[PDB]
Amino acid sequence: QVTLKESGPGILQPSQTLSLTCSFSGFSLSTYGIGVGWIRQPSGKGLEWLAHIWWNDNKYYNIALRSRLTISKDTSNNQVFLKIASVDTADTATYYCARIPDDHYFDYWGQGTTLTVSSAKTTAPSVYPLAPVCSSVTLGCLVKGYFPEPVTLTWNSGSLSSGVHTFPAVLQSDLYTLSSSVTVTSSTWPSQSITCNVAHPASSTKVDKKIEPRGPTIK
Amino acid sequence: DVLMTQTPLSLPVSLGDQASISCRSSQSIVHSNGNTYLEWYLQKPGQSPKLLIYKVSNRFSGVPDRFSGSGSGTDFTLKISRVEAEDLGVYYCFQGSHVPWTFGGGTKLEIKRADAAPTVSIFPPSSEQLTSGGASVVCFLNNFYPKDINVKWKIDGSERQNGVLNSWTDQDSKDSTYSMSSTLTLTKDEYERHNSYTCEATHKTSTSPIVKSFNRNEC
């Protein structure tokens, strides 16, 4: 059975208070030796332990953050709550809650909610087609200035899959950016239309971008 | 505040090969109760970490005969003898002995293949982007091995350091190669001054760099 699900705000403004709930089944915190803890993983980096509470209500917090951290259990309804105060862009991470089976360590981790701390407002992506300079042909698609993450990119509405390279998003300024290269035989393109499809669930923005060959223009 | 040090950062292994991950702590990790709390977690891409070895040598649920944990006091080691598809990902040595509980930097188990040189593709700023006011210059370095690469941006011969944003893909599911995008972001005013735009790339496959360039005249 053993399941750990963690509920979070997912996205919030700097200096607000982050409040998250690790709901669980398959074990009770009313049982002996049992404990639940919190770990955070920043956007493709190593893990970091935050805090944990034991069955007897003994709380252990990271000496690094301490003051902002408050952990409390709710034995009756199988829930644990971690609350971090006055958050900043430094706290943009994925937060996991994990069970301590007696001995000092974690055994079953949960799915892990993803939190993003930013001042930025909801913004639809600007899809820019990348046709080559004025055999095989390489085409691109630059998705720029969107908020928040994530964006979903396909080529020819999923028909094109071979030689596709979507790159991870990079935080441009207050907003994200990403690219995806596509390589086809010189006989496939221009001759047959290649369309880059982007979908931004947050801003409910679905865009098709026909990448046509680079034409000339003098000012 | 125990410093956990993993060796190496990236592990290139063939399939069925014998693999050994090295962990080394800043101090003795023997907990008051006599037990040494060294754990090994395997985090697969787009998933929460999962426990393999707990208490230096003991195997967790559904952790095969192939995985073996050793060491004592300072140096510890995980051995995976006949590497399979399921066995790839990021490994972290963890300690439950002293509070604050700390994780290792992580070791990436990746598959080694033949040496391959990148396919550089330079993309000038699109007509769609220039009208809006911006001027991003994309460069894709596709399908190479090993993962370590280096890109230099040369505007009119002069090297640029500031204003470059790079992203790297994971290892290819099919061809087991890496790809990298490199976006030199510029204002239209800056871009509208200069002519030659070069995306110079260096990789172990060849002694001399792989130059890819365009001129603002034609496009």
Author numbering:
A (entry chain A): 1 to 134, 140 to 224
B (entry chain B): 1 to 219
Q: Paper's wording?
A:
ErbB4 (HER4) is a member of the ErbB subfamily of receptor tyrosine kinases (RTK) that also includes EGFR (also known as ErbB1 or HER1), ErbB2 (c-Neu, HER2) and ErbB3 (HER3). Similar to other RTKs, ligand interaction with ErbB4 promotes receptor dimerization, kinase activation, and initiation of phosphorylation-dependent signaling cascades, such as the mitogen-activated protein kinase (MAPK) and phosphoinositide 3-kinase (PI3-K)/Akt pathways. In addition to promoting these indirect signaling cascades, ErbB4 has been demonstrated to relay signals from the cell surface by releasing a soluble intracellular domain (ICD) fragment, in a process called regulated intramembrane proteolysis (RIP). RIP involves shedding of the ErbB4 extracellular domain via the activity of tumor necrosis factor-alpha converting enzyme (TACE/ADAM17) generating a substrate for a secondary cleavage at the plasma membrane by γ-secretase activity.
An indication that RIP-mediated ErbB4 signaling may be biologically significant comes from the fact that the ERBB4 gene is alternatively spliced creating isoforms (juxtamembrane isoform JM-a) capable of undergoing RIP, as well as isoforms (JM-b) that lack the TACE cleavage site. In addition, we address the effect of mAb 1479 on ErbB4 cleavage and breast tumor formation in a xenograft mouse model in vivo. Finally, we demonstrate by X-ray crystallography and mutagenesis studies that mAb 1479 binds to the C-terminal region of ErbB4 subdomain IV at a site encompassing JM-a-specific residues. These observations indicate that ErbB4 is cleaved in a subset of breast cancer tissues in vivo, and that mAbs targeted at ErbB4 may be a potential therapeutic option to suppress ErbB4 cleavage.
